[PDB]
Amino acid sequence: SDIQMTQSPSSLSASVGDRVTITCRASQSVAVAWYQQKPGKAPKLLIYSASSLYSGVPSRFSGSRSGTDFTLTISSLQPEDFATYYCQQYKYVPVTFGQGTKVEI
Amino acid sequence: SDIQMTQSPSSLSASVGDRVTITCRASQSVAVAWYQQKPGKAPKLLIYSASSLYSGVPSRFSGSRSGTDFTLTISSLQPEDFATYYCQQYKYVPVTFGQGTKVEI
Amino acid sequence: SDIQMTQSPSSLSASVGDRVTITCRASQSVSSAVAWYQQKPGKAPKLLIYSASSLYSGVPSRFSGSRSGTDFTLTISSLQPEDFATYYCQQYKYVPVTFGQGTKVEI
Amino acid sequence: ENTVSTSLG
Amino acid sequence: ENTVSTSLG
Amino acid sequence: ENTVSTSLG
Amino acid sequence: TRVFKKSSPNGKLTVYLGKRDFVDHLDKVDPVDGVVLVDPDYLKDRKVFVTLTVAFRYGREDCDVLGLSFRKDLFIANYQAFPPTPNPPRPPTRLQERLLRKLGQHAHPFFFTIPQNLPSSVTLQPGPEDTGKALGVDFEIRAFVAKSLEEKSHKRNSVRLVIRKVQFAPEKPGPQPSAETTRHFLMSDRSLHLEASLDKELYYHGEPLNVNVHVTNNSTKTVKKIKVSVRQYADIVLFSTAQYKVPVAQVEQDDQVSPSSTFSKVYTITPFLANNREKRGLALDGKLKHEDTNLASSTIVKEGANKEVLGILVSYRVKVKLVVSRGGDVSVELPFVLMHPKPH
Amino acid sequence: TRVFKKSSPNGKLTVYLGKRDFVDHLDKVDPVDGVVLVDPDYLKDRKVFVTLTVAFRYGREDCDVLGLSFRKDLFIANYQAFPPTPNPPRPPTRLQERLLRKLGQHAHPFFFTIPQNLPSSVTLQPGPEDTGKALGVDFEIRAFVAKSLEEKSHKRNSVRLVIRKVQFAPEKPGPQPSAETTRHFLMSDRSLHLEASLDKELYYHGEPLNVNVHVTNNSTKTVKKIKVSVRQYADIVLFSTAQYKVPVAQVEQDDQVSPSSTFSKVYTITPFLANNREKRGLALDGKLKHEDTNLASSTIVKEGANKEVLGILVSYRVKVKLVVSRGGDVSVELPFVLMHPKPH
Amino acid sequence: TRVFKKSSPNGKLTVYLGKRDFVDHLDKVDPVDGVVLVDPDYLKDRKVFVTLTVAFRYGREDCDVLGLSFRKDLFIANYQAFPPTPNPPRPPTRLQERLLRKLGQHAHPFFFTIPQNLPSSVTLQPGPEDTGKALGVDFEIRAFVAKSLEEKSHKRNSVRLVIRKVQFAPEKPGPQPSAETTRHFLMSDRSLHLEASLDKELYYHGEPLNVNVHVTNNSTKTVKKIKVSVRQYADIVLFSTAQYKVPVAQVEQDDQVSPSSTFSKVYTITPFLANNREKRGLALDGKLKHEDTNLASSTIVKEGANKEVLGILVSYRVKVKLVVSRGGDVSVELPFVLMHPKPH
Amino acid sequence: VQLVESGGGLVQPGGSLRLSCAASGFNVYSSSIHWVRQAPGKGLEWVASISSYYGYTYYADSVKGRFTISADTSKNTAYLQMNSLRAEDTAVYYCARSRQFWYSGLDYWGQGTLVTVS
Amino acid sequence: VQLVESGGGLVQPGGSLRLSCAASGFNVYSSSIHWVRQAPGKGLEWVASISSYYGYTYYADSVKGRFTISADTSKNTAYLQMNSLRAEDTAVYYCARSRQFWYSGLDYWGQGTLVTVSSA
Amino acid sequence: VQLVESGGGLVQPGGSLRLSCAASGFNVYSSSIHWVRQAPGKGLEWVASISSYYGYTYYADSVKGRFTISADTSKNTAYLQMNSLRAEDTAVYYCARSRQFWYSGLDYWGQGTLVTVSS
Incomplete structure (x- = not known):
């Protein structure tokens, strides 16, 4: 069946310099990519294969795997890192996206 | 073209316990079976392959081959051994039977 | 293209006992596949030399043939009194086979 | 019965 | 010419 | 090219 | 009893065999024994050889149908019928001695042994395009007269006999499927x-x-x-x-x-x-x-x-x-x- | 990290592998490291064997009703998983020892080497008349338990894995055509x-x-x-x-x-x-x-x-x-x- | 007389052969005599090798888009044209020495001998489905420049020449059929x-x-x-x-x-x-x-x-x-x- | 093991009559079914046979075309469909069994059914 | 490397609209083209995909048969032909790219074009 | 060995004429048959040839389509069916033989038959 990809929390607020993390759990085992979208802009890829950092992405972004749960972590949250983050799988067709997580000040 | 099987005599008589032999001559070389028919009943096989005794029949019955001539021999005539005996070949289709030998009491 | 066999001279005259030669130039190379035929006046030609050097059986030894590149020559050591005739040069490397124009050897 | 994957820790 | 049988002694 | 003959003298 | 007799087309060479089907009991195959008869005056410097061969065959290539005919040997054996070699191994058996008694001293025994690893007789079913015969593995006995084993056969002084290697049901029942x-x-x-x-x-x-x-x-x-x-x-x-x-x-x-x-x-x-x-x-x-x-x-x-x-x-x-x-x-x-x- | 795991149809024999595609960089080929898990109580003096084979296959044993399923071997290697053979190669790979630590004492490492003279994985495209699979050369890792190398060849007690040998673009550019x-x-x-x-x-x-x-x-x-x-x-x-x-x-x-x-x-x-x-x-x-x-x-x-x-x-x-x-x-x-x- | 010659497409390597058809006399076949011409500077310490090969072939390198083209060797011979090998065969043939005189020091004789058992030149007739050539046995002479026989060099600096092995009617009447x-x-x-x-x-x-x-x-x-x-x-x-x-x-x-x-x-x-x-x-x-x-x-x-x-x-x-x-x-x-x- | 014939009686000349030989105790593919008729006084005579394993049916030349033998493998039963009955077709008909592989005589016979034509 | 979307505007319900994603800087056979729409008040969502190398084309179950995506390999361009447009089809449409061989996510995205469906 | 051809005479322009060359002493499959005509004064000129072994017939460009050469094995005879005869077709026609394996010149020639074309 279609993969139900759920990420939490729906929103979180942290001042500049804090450490935040976003989780993502699939319906069944899956090949996970993370994208960051600024408001009014196209999404920009951050991590592919759930661990491999994309070229040009700052090293503060991190990705890890634990069974079916996937986590996106920012070690030191820069003043420009406030955006909406998405969680995607591409193991099976169709490819499903997460519901998003708005990181605010 | 069919094989003609002739057996002699047409009839014979022996009181009891006598030596009775019946010959059967094939027109062409042949795979010979001997059958005994009681009056008013179906025949039952006695010897197949012209020498192999059938299972369950008494050992007094015997058969032998000498070229294209086949012989059925009874060592001792039982009181119930009066019947008509038939000579058959099954080397070629159709199979042909003998004319019978009414062994009287 | 077609091969043109050019034979010279068109005619020659020599008394008995002389030595004559007849040449045959091929427009294109024929790989020594050249034959020479002799025709008496009012008669069928007779093969003399095949492969431009091999003398045909029965032909007298005075007839000679040689190859020099694309040029082929027919030579007679001594013109017998019956050796007057028209001689033709033929190639058979390519189809069609082309003949020479003839060389009338007179007495 | 089929090829799967394992953590290995 | 063909396989045929014969009587052993 | 291809095969061709020569004089050999 | 009876024995099987086949002769060469010229009639001067004849091979006698006891059975046509030879069984193997999972540990020993029935030995192939027999005698071969030849006219003494027909051969003076010639020798009689008997060969047993089992081979893959797609149609016999000694018959009269036109087309392809494969043949891949799997096992070949040879035996010198005449003049006799040293008698051992396998001295003449009862069947061989009885045949030699029957046709006198102009017959010569020949003996063969079928190795265990050899396959049985299996014939594949021909298709519509496989006219004549099809692929299969079969056994053959050939008796011929020649000066040497490598000498080419006349095909008119040689006799070929077809035999079979068969198996029967073991008497010990196996596990229930x-x-x-x-x-x-x-x-x-x-x-x-x-x-x-x-x-x-x-x-x-x-x-x-x-x-x-x-x-x-x-x-x-x-x-x-x-x-x-x-x-x-x-x-x-x-x-x-x-x-x-x-x-x-x-x-x-x-x-x-x-x-x-x-x-x-x-x-x-x-x-x-x-x-x-x-x-x-x-x-x-x-x-x-x-x-x-x-x-x-x-x-x-x-x-x-x-x-x-x-x-x-x-x-x-x-x-x-x-x-x-x-x-x-x-x-x-x-x-x-x-x-x-x-x-x- | 992750590893690949496959088990026998019986569910008692399991082979662990770290990769599926092994690289050929023209001087070495990645060794086929892994461990195999089996319970010695089921063994009962039986031996576990792992074989790496590259074969020129056409079709497979996928219960497809069709013949002409050719199979030509190209290289065969064997390894006795249990009981352990002499040590060499002495040091088990880091993945091997990590897997042994994770699984305990019931897993046994097996090691293989791919010689330089072996081909890569190539599959020929099937035609309309072919079904299931077509001609091609491929690698296979098979783990089975038997007293000898041919004692328990039944498929219901062995696990077979498919691996690949691949090559990538050399970093040194070649001459301009x-x-x-x-x-x-x-x-x-x-x-x-x-x-x-x-x-x-x-x-x-x-x-x-x-x-x-x-x-x-x-x-x-x-x-x-x-x-x-x-x-x-x-x-x-x-x-x-x-x-x-x-x-x-x-x-x-x-x-x-x-x-x-x-x-x-x-x-x-x-x-x-x-x-x-x-x-x-x-x-x-x-x-x-x-x-x-x-x-x-x-x-x-x-x-x-x-x-x-x-x-x-x-x-x-x-x-x-x-x-x-x-x-x-x-x-x-x-x-x-x-x-x-x-x-x- | 005349002599056949052929050159590489680069026009630097040339091989001379006196005949194209070599007749088999049933006790000895005509030896393959010829010389190969190559400039000693173009080689640059490379070696000139000439090989004689006869092989089963189903279509040659005719650049035909048809896929299948089989090739099975039957006999392979090699000869090191340059630098010269030891003396035997010590005396060059008259054709070889005349060619060397005509060409100079840049030509090098090469000698071949065809064994008795080799087959003749036979060509199977192509069928309607077969395009170009078909199955057959043919002889070949190849000259190429390389450091060794096994080197994979630029194979366009080579010349291939096709020769034939033939037989003629024996000069004696045989038995009347x-x-x-x-x-x-x-x-x-x-x-x-x-x-x-x-x-x-x-x-x-x-x-x-x-x-x-x-x-x-x-x-x-x-x-x-x-x-x-x-x-x-x-x-x-x-x-x-x-x-x-x-x-x-x-x-x-x-x-x-x-x-x-x-x-x-x-x-x-x-x-x-x-x-x-x-x-x-x-x-x-x-x-x-x-x-x-x-x-x-x-x-x-x-x-x-x-x-x-x-x-x-x-x-x-x-x-x-x-x-x-x-x-x-x-x-x-x-x-x-x-x-x-x-x-x- | 038993064989039972059925379908006796009298049929006018030129008629038809089908006889059913119901087999029991043996398989129809491991055995062959044969029909043998015995005219009053005259000895035995084989008329027809069927081999279910190979799918072959054989008939005597005196019954070729007129008589047809068939077997239903579902219930291990054979039938002999007789057509164009003539005066010389009267006889006691026995259906007999033999081993399909390596025939060794008609070991099993039926009790026989009398057929009359007049 | 760039991707440009064109063909926005408003279409009446039941209508149709085709958008062209003009690719540049990469080959159409070494990469795959995907269309992802983002409805207002809703995150991303995959719509359709095309693989020019294998000649394959995939659609989400909500656009099956309704939408058609094709690529013009001559000029490195892809099109998405939408038919039977409904009120739920309004979104900002991005044409994305992934490596054809062993895709590692949608690395390159277009600037995005707005598609609106209403009874106007 | 002999070669006799017949069928000469005069044919009006545009007509047709068939000449038969009867071959004796050699087989038709081990030899090739050629027709060579010689115009009065002009030298020889090849016309057509037939190879019964390979079943191939060749014609000169001046007679292509117009002339047809054929032979039958039973009588060891060849024919030249000439159609659309023109004024330049007049010549003395010789049927010549050559060895099939292999061609070594036209060793045997016919007696020579004369064909004339005029109005």
Whole structure:
């Protein structure tokens, strides 16, 4: 069946310099990519294969795997890192996206 | 073209316990079976392959081959051994039977 | 293209006992596949030399043939009194086979 | 019965 | 010419 | 090219 | 008793043989013994040689049909009939001595031994385009007169005889066939389980096969139909390990196994040749020349090191398959042997 | 990290592997490291054997009712998993020891080495008359338990795994392709010349090829058509050096080169699989089970020391053909390699 | 005289050969004598190697887009042209020394010897489905520049030359063919006798064959038709002895032989190529590249009964068959040899 | 093991009559079914045979075309469909069994059914 | 490397609209083209995909049969032909790119074009 | 060995004429038959040839389509069927023989038959 990809929390607020993390759990085992979208802009890829950092992405972004749960972590949250983050799988067709997580000040 | 099987005599008589032999001559070389028919009943096989005794029949019955001539021999005539005996070949289709030998009491 | 066999001279005259030669130039190379035929006046030609050097059986030894590149020559050591005739040069490397124009050897 | 994957820790 | 049988002694 | 003959003298 | 006699087309060379079919008891094959008769005045400096050969053959290439004819030897043996070699090994047997008594001193015994690893006689079924004959492995005895083994045969002073190597049903019954496979779904404990088994391990030719199948469909999926088949596996190892598999018998039953219900039934299936005439490549028993023969018996081999046999090995298995609805299928295979009973 | 795990149909024998594709960098091939898990109580003095085999297969044992399932071995290796053999190689790999720590004392490492003279994984495209699978060479890891190497050959107690041997694009660029042929008319000083070249020697899959042709038609004959194509050469040498060449991409232009003039153009041609589905015998990259793989990568070799690889070798060439009136045809062939870039 | 020459496409390596057809005299075949010309500077410490090879081939490197093109070697020989090998064979042939005088120090003699057992040049006729060339055995001479025989260099600096191995009619008359076969009847003493005999052992290409047949039909059965035919037997032996036989000429006469009557007649039959162009797999004489050639000449074999001739052997026989009512036909076969007369 | 014939009686000349030989105790594919008739006084005479394993049916020349033998393998039963009955077709008909593989005589016979034509 | 979307605007319900994603800087056979729409008040969602190398084309179940995506390999361009447009089809449409061989996510995205569906 | 041809005479322009060359002493499959005409004064000129072994017939460009050459094995005879006869077709026609394996010149020639064309 279609993969139900759920990420939490729906929103979180942290001042500049804090450490935040976003989780993502699939319906069944899956090949996970993370994208960051600024408001009014196209999404920009951050991590592919759930661990491999994309070229040009700052090293503060991190990705890890634990069974079916996937986590996106920012070690030191820069003043420009406030955006909406998405969680995607591409193991099976169709490819499903997460519901998003708005990181605010 | 069919094989003609002739057996002699047409009839014979022996009181009891006598030596009775019946010959059967094939027109062409042949795979010979001997059958005994009681009056008013179906025949039952006695010897197949012209020498192999059938299972369950008494050992007094015997058969032998000498070229294209086949012989059925009874060592001792039982009181119930009066019947008509038939000579058959099954080397070629159709199979042909003998004319019978009414062994009287 | 077609091969043109050019034979010279068109005619020659020599008394008995002389030595004559007849040449045959091929427009294109024929790989020594050249034959020479002799025709008496009012008669069928007779093969003399095949492969431009091999003398045909029965032909007298005075007839000679040689190859020099694309040029082929027919030579007679001594013109017998019956050796007057028209001689033709033929190639058979390519189809069609082309003949020479003839060389009338007179007495 | 089929090829799967394992953590290995 | 063909396989045929014969009587052993 | 291809095969061709020569004089050999 | 009787013996088989065949003579050369010129009539000056004749070979006598006791049997046409030689059996192997899984440990010793019947020795091939016989005598060869030749006119003493016909040969003065010539010698009589008898050769036993078993080979892959796609049609005999000594007959009169036009086309391709392959021949790959698998084993070759030679024997010097005349003049005699030292008598050992294998001094003359009772049959050989009786024949020598019968035709005097102008007959000469010849002896052969069939090695254990050699294959049996199997003939593949010809197709519509395989006119004349088809592929198969067969045994041959050739008696010829020549100065040397390498001398070319005249074909008019040589005689060829066809013999067979056959096997019969072992008297010791084997384990009862049985095999079960459980199809499981990752959603929950809704496993679908079926069990299939036979009543014995060895079946005679024409004897029906009774197979019992028990199905426990505990899932929401339903079984559309159940089919039971018997398939023949032929292994050809001439150069590379090829394999031909072909169904020799099938039975179809539209039996619906409702969800959360149990099913049990007994199926009767019998393989025979009347319905498998068109199946090209079907393995058949060894033929002498052209007579009709049944399906090839299973080529059974007793344990051992399993030496590489480069002939045709034929096996039989029963295939039970369930086609569950909306995707998926579960199947069971249980093998059995099939061969003739030992003659009395 | 992650590892691959497969278990026997019985569910008692399990083999662990770290990868599926093993790289061949022309000096070494990645060793097949792994451990196999088995409970000694089920063993009962039985021995566990792991065999690595690369074979020239056609079809498989997937219960597909069809014969001619050929199988030719190319290299066979064996390893006694239990009981342990002498130590060498002495140090178990980091993955091996990590797996042994994770699973306990019931797992046993097994080690393999792939010799340099072995081919890569190549699959030939099936035709309409083929089903299930087609010809191709592939690698296999098989784990089974038996007293000897041929004691328990039944499939219900063994686990078989499919692996791949792959090659990637060398980082050192090669010479720039170029080829010139002059069509001399052996009647006058008239001649025809043409030059073809490529911008690079190595191209990735899907990357377009830029070929430029320079024609100086100093002749009365007129060039009527220009053909540019890419061909794939598949050497299938197993016992006889058979070859199969097939055009994988073509581009045509009605470029009439006027007599006594000059011509220059650049052609772009890209080989892909969408237009080559029907071409039976086309070489494809080795598949795992059935998934789509691209066009076969060219099999590069070391600088010399050719050792007559017995598998399938695939190479690519670009052919430029000029169609001219009344004969005098001329063509040019220049080869190139096709590889995947090395992963980061 | 004349001498053949051929050069590499780069025009730097040239090989000279005095003949193209080498005749086999059944005790020794003509040695391959020639020289190879190459500038000593272009080599740059490279070595010039010349190899003689005869191989089964199904299509050469004809640039044909058709895929399959098999190749199986039968014999391989090598020779190091430059630098020179040790002295033997010490004396160069007169052709070799004359060529060296004509060309200078840049030419180097190379010598080859063809073993006795090698086959002749035979070409199988291509079928309608086959394009270009077809199966056949042919000889080849290749000259190339490399550091060693096994080096994979730029193979465009090589020259390939096709030569032929041929045989001619032996200069002696063989035994006159003749064969008799009497059809005996079991039902009585009646017997049908058939005789057939030729007039010569050897026939030239295009020469008619006269067959004398005498029939003594001393039986009630009536002969309905008499058929006289000539068949060609091709023995293709590369891995297994495969034989292909195809009729090349036939003549049919409705000559009914009445019961209790004698019949005698002479039939004239001539085998040629015009009527049988369509017969796929027909053995033809070895072609150089594509030129038309006649039916394959018979291959006489060494009188020492040598074996393992790994090639194609072609022979001819005349079959006379009598069509008898109610079946029971009788046939007679007469073998003859077809050759070319020895050139003058 | 038993064999039972059925379908006796009298049929006018030119008529027809079908006889059913119901077999029990043996398989129809491992055995061959043969029909033998015995005219009153005259000895035995083989008329027809069937081989279910190979699918072959054989008939005597005196009954070729008129008589047809068939077997239903579902219930192990053979039938002999006789057509164009003539006066010389009257006889006691026995259905007999023999081993399909390597025939060794007609070991099993039926009790026989009398057929009359007049 | 760039991707440009064109063909926005408003379409009445039941209408149709085709958008062209003009690709540049990469080959159409070495990469795959995907269309991802983002409805206002809703995250991303995959719509359709095309693989020019294998000649394959995939659609989400909500656009199956309704939408069609094709690529013009000559000029490195892809099009998405929408038919039977409904009120739920309004979104900002991005045409994305992934590596054809062993895709590692949608690395390159277009600037995005707005598609609106209403009864206007 | 002999070669006799017959069928001469005069034919009006545009007509047709068939000439038969009867061959004796040699087989038709081991030899090739050629027709060579010689115009009065002008030298020899090849016309047509037939090879019964390969079943191939060749014609000169001046007679292509117009002339047809054929032979039958039974009588060991060849024919030249000439159609659309023109004024330049007049010549003395010789039928010549050549060896099939292999061509070594036209060794045997016919007696020579005369063909005339005029109005």
